[PDB]
Symmetry: C6
Subunit: 64 residues, 6 copies
Amino acid sequence: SLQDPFLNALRRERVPVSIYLVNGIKLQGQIESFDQFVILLKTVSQMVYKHAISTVVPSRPVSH
Amino acid sequence: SLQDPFLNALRRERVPVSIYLVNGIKLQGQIESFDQFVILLKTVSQMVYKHAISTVVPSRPVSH
Amino acid sequence: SLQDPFLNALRRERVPVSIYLVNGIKLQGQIESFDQFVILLKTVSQMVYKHAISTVVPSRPVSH
Amino acid sequence: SLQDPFLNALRRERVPVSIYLVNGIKLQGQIESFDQFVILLKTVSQMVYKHAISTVVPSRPVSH
Amino acid sequence: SLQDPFLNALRRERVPVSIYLVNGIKLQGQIESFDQFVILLKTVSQMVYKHAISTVVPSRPVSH
Amino acid sequence: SLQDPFLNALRRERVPVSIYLVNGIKLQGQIESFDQFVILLKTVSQMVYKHAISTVVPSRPVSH
């Protein structure tokens, strides 16, 4: 109810984001797409499993 | 049955909280919103997956 | 079938407990309440996600 | 289909076991009881969440 | 909705991939097959549980 | 759809396997049996929770 509109706003607005993983790695890029279980983060797109994500941090505020 | 009224009390009362992640990071801010799987924590709001959270600690006691 | 009566006994008897988290932290306090996914542990009550808990250890034996 | 008869054999036969947790801790004792999500391991009984367990190792072979 | 066509594209196109695990290990190979819970990664094929995967990174862009 | 025939092939053929856990431990033995949630790995058989497994690696290729 909140997750989907937040991720969709980031995707639609092409906002650069930081995705912090539970193991301490920081990914950065734009959300190309997402589904129930994964986020596709744009050299290639990488498929990130949500279960591995701790936080998604927009580079700037977004309407949601 | 307990989680939702606790989080809602924190959100409604705008109580500063600490969210401790399973990987040892401490986040701090106010709960803007939450749903089944995520908490939105207010420079930007960040989307925190519950699966990554160990504990939510209010800065002061809250009615719940 | 076992979890609920065990936690309820600890709550009802107000037994001090240690809650060990998967990341190695030890929490201590009394169980105020619990639900499907969280335990509320009593300066403030903190909301502990069960997914982050490894073991719940009573400070003394309890009827269950 | 395998988990329940294995755990029940350990419980019924009162076999000492080692329960290794995902965080590297080793617990030892006898299985008093178990349910869908937890194992009760016998100074006090401690409630171990299965999600925190990596392996259950009997101290000797058991019929199962 | 996104995961399955992405993995299927990698499998069909036999694209070398890197599979990063939550514990920091990097696996490399070609996706032979996958199902709801596992990916088979091609000396032998190894069965990788999705719950252990953080990211799947194609070695080159793929139609999806 | 893939996991069950792979594990069954390993079990039926009694192929030595390595089971790598998410915490970095390596287990070795033969799969005696498995179910939805656990694998029984043959001094004693140990019960390994799948949630703790990262990869299952056959010692030699197997029909599947």
